[PDB]
């Protein structure tokens, strides 16, 4: 049967109950021993109520806000016996302050991204770069130097951000051994920076194409997506972001960087999903994904970064988010951005409209002596549904993400705030894997300048093909 | 009962049976009286020999080439008894070439594209400036300098080039009755520029959201449209092009114009089918539309261009595709650029395939003192199938065109070298105008820069909101 990996003995908050918590309940209810009763969601939802109601689960029909976050979560995250667990799946909440009030109080806290309290974005107050996941990000790392140690907390532990951390960890090794290269793996991060270095790694995309569809086609003034379309639309209006490699040699016009932070990352000035870039994977081949910002985007490239005694950077890799998601979704932002508004309604695809697909997710390392690497899931809706209820493909990616780094926060409660590329990268799989259907590494040959120059005149650099400059389309 | 326009007593010569070919010869068939002997197809697929046989119509299953066009076609022309009609339905054949030979041995020509031969499309030591469609227009425009009047020869006579020239024509007369204009309605070239001028048209899309769709999704690595497959991908590999106007203030970077010809057009250094233009139609609102190359974008405009006495343009309008295609075609272009080369297989979608939809197709008028006029069909696909059998919506637009082009004709068969702008537009309205389903004139305040600026700094233009600076996606 199903592993049960460890007793929660305290409660289990769940906020919010969308395509990601509907997913990740039941690995919750099936993978931890604890009373029934100590778990409970909250979401201002109605539908997701009407859910609750039928799995018969506690729920609170709320929308947690800057103003009652703390009467309502710390009572129950607080109820006991002992250390409860606050799952963190929702939209329009600060993760930031939601996770130093579970901390201040002794709760585990994990969470898929660093989102702001509602207002945040739709204010005409805010630079382009403050509205950046670098800057988002940096809040999380300076509460971890205001408040170092203390209770786990688990930052951007989803599939993406999330898992593909893990995934770079097991291509670099993957990479490593098929050299030749024979010797333990790195244990620290300066050890996995350098790996990448002496590797030749030069930039990561997070290379994604879902082929998920439904049985109905997309409908006119809808957005459609596998998983949240707020979500979605929201970072996809975000600035295009990447963690940015010291071997690049050429950013646009539009290109901004950062005054202060770890950095590693630069941002342009127009939205991420509506910028293509030229990527790679097994099922797609060659296709445009789009640079939809993403916190490991940063975060890979910040954790493989090697600095010399000065503590200037000499070594990072270029990370960025390469995605292309449903054809349906592709149609949506085709609409969205053609006609310069939000369509009026929304729908994200459950299992039961899916008719088949699968969603293509892994990190392709590029420019080292292989040229291209891609590592990571090729989970199909027909497996999901053998293995996990009530998600499509996209969701038990994440879902089953946010299991494995409950699992390592409950093994390690006394890490202080963490991101996935602080975790025990074998652990993490170890449980994740079971819902990750086939999981493989495949080379290639192409690179961003294959078939160019074409017909027209266009800024490449043959030197070097895996360049920004190649890769952004232009 | 249907009109039978007038009897046809020499040979009908179809030159390709695809798509159009198919749609068009039920029409011929239907409203021309003529021994049914006398017509020839000529196309070098199976497929077609199959359709043919199965209409018992002859059938000669060749390719037109250069090398054999003179020896194959002027038998097929002359043979009598009286005027041939020699209707070119291909790709890769020579428009101006067949057309010169239609008209060098007495037979009338129509056509709904200036093609070149085979090899021309992607051959590697012409210049981009030589690809463009202003560039195969001039050819068509010198044949006639070198040989005024003669037999009439009707160049680009389908949907769009061809019917939208009559509707650009309807919709100045309703214009100028909407905003008071005082005058006889024109009856020659310069009173129609005349006309655009004082109404103060700044310039015309033609403005086309074709809603077609399958009871398949779209098939990974097949590039689905509703109109040819090879020539759409073939204008869309050209550079995207457009006719001018005396407002336009500015033109990008990789803008080129041409140093000789009618002065009328400009194209950029970069694909078609891969630059986007904001635009709109009645049932898509706001969208994008893509710059596709077409005769027509630099026909009407050289049509409405008023010199003063030195020859000087001293109005034209702008004047370009804004061209929305099915979603599986814009899917496919998605794949294909994003790909970096064409799929290995294709389909034009069958009415026998296609669950719903229209192709609305109409021309939009802007910068008058109602802003923009939008005038045009919304023909559907169940419509389409009650009037007219072996086509879809989009086929019967062009199918119809050269129906009334036939009749333009024979009613007008000593004209010379003549395009859509050049035929009376109200006789070919007549004949084509019941196979368009609904005909609509319709007003908008929409501007380009509707919603604009938004979150991130953008070059426009905020004195006047039609300036290809505002249209242009950048
Ligand atoms: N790291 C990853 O791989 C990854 C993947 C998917 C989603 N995500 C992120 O996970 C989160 C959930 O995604 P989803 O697909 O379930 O989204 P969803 O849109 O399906 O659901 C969001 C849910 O949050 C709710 N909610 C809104 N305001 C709330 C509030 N003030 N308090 C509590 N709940 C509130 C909605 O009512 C709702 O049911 C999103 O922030 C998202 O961007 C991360
Ligand atoms: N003006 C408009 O509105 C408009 C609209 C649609 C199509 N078109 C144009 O009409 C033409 C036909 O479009 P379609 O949808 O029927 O295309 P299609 O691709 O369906 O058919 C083209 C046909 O030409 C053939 N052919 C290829 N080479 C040939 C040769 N050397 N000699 C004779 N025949 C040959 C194919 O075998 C074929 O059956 C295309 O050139 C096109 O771009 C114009
Ligand atoms: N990383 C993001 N910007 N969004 C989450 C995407 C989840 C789909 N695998
Ligand atoms: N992941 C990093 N960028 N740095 C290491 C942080 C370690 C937190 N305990
Ligand atoms: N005008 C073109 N570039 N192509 C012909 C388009 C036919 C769809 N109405
Ligand atoms: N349509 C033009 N641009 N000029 C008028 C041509 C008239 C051909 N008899």
């Known amino acids: 049967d199903w592993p049960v990996y460890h007793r929660i003995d305290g409660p289990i908050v769940m906020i919010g109950f969308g395509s990601i918590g509907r997913g990740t309940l039941p690995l919750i209810e099936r993978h931890f021993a604890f009373d029934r009763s100590k778990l409970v969601v909250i979401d201002p939802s109605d539908e997701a109520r009407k859910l609750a109601e039928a799995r018969g689960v506690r729920f609170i029909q709320q929308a947690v806000t800057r103003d009652n976050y703390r009467e309502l979560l710390v009572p129950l995250l607080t109820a006991g016996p002992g250390q409860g667990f606050c799952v963190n799946l929702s939209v329009d909440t600060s993760s930031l302050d939601i996770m130093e009030l579970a901390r201040e109080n002794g709760a585990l806290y994990i969470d898929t991204v660093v989102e702001p309290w509602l207002g945040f974005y739709f204010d005409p107050d805010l630079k382009p770069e403050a509205r950046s996941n670098y800057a988002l990000r940096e809040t999380v790392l300076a509460a971890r130097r205001n408040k170092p140690g203390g209770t786990t907390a688990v930052s951007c532990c989803g599939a993406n951000p999330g898992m593909v951390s893990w995934f770079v960890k097991q291509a670099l090794v993957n990479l490593a051994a098929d050299l030749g290269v024979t010797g333990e793996e790195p244990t620290t991060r300066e050890e996995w920076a350098r790996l990448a270095m ?114 200037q950077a000499v070594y990072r890799p270029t990370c960025h988010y390469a995605y292309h998601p449903c054809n349906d979704a592709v149609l949506s932002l085709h609409e969205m951005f ?43 809706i027909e497996e999901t549904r053998r293995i996990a209820p009530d998600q499509n493909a996209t969701g038990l990616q994440v879902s089953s993400a946010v299991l494995a780094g409950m699992v390592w926060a ?65």
Not at 279 to 290: I, L, R
Not at 295 to 307: K, M, Y
């Open 338 to 380: 053609g006609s310069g508004k939000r369509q009026s309604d929304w729908r994200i695809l459950d299992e039961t409209e899916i008719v088949d697909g699968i969603d293509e997710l892994g990190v392709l390392l590029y420019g080292h002596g292989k040229n291209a690497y891609w590592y990571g899931s090729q989970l199909s």
């Open 198 to 311: 002496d590797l030749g790694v030069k930039g990561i995309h997070i290379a994604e194409r879902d082929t998920q569809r439904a049985s109905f086609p997309k409908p006119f003034d809808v957005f459609v997506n596998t998983w949240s379309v707020e979500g979605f639309v929201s970072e996809g209006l975000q600035p295009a972001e990447l963690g940015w490699g010291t071997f690049e040699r050429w950013m646009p016009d539009n290109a901004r960087g950062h005054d202060s932070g770890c950095g590693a990352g630069i941002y342009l000035l127009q939205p991420g999903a509506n910028t293509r870039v030229r990527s790679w994977t097994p099922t797609a081949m060659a296709q445009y994904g789009f640079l939809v910002t993403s916190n490991e985007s940063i975060s890979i490239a910040d954790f493989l970064t090697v600095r010399d005694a000065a503590g």
């Open 410 to 474: 409950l093994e390690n409660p006394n890490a202080g705030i963490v991101e996935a590329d602080d975790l025990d990268f074998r652990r993490c799989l170890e449980v994740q894997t079971p819902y990750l259907g086939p999981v493989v590494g495949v080379y290639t040959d192409w690179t961003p300048l294959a078939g160019r120059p074409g017909l027209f005149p266009e800024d490449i650099d043959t030197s070097d093909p895996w360049q920004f400059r190649n890769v952004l389309v232009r």
